[PDB]
């Protein structure tokens, strides 16, 4: 029986649609962790109880150095608390906008981290689907740790694949797309399909319309091209990515 006053709540780490996340310390052990607080009301209202059960049930039974651990859960009358591992070095999201953009070496590292983490998820038939820089956290060693399985399951739209947005059947190849989009954003500082309008982005994703800035190598260009295909099955397995020369050359 875990309950709210077993923890002391620190600065608010993230804000969210439904709930927030704070730094927290369990009193008995002095254990630092992140503590997601969700609001029953808003969840019921948007009817996502199932997806929360999913997230929890999925992230709870996952073991990998690049996947934010989920230690436990509990809830009171009004809210639900998710007890999570804490990422000292923050989010890649801020990391990017802070650094403007990433070199090929950092980029290719973060990708192999993801690809590893994703292989794993797929090796358990789990599609994250919602992979974006505000879901990628940095460990104390600066390692990438994916998180927020609020849209995870089994076999804004910038990071969604066409099949998804059009309302069609999808699979592990979803993450491959995201891996693509993500790789592009690291190098360029902006997602390939970004746009002022929703339905404008939709079109660009649907028609697959992107164009590399001058400063991206044929190598990078390559990977990204192979990775962003309208046809899910044209997209490389994760093994293929991991051994993509440009990644080999520069990953670490
Ligand atoms: C931000 C930030 N700066 N520094 C130095 C560390 C962090 C940090 N954030 C986290 C976080 C964290 C934050 N946001 N989110 C996602 C979210 C937020 C609000 C509602 C729903 C989902 C996770 C976590 Cl879980 C786990 N560890 C974290 N560490």
Author numbering: 127 to 281, 292 to 388
Quote what the paper states about this structure.
As part of our medicinal chemistry programme to discover selective inhibitors of Aurora-A,12 we introduced the 1-benzyl-1H-pyrazol-4-yl moiety at C7 of the imidazo[4,5-b]pyridine scaffold to provide 7a. In biochemical assays, 7a inhibited both Aurora-A and Aurora-B with IC50 values of 0.212 and 0.461 μM, respectively. To understand the potential for further improvement, we obtained the crystal structure of 7a bound to Aurora-A22. This structure shows the ligand in the ATP binding site with the pyridine nitrogen atom hydrogen bonded to the backbone NH of Ala213 and the imidazole NH interacting with the carbonyl of Ala213, consistent with previous reports of the hinge binding mode for the imidazo[4,5-b]pyridine scaffold. Similar to crystal structures of previous compounds 1, 15 and 16 (compounds 51 and 40c in Ref. 10, and compound 21a in Ref. 11, respectively) the N-benzyl substituent on the C7-pyrazole is oriented towards the P-loop, making Van der Waals contacts with Val147 and Gly142. In an attempt to improve the aqueous solubility, the Aurora inhibitory potency and kinase selectivity of this sub-series, we explored the introduction of basic substituents such as 1-methylpiperazine and pyrrolidine as well as replacement of the phenyl ring with a more polar heterocycle. This approach was guided by the ligand/protein interactions observed in the protein crystal structure of 7a, which showed that the N-benzyl substituent on the C7-pyrazole is oriented towards the P-loop. Compounds 7a and 14d interact with the P-loop whereas 14a and 14b engage with Thr217 in the post-hinge region.
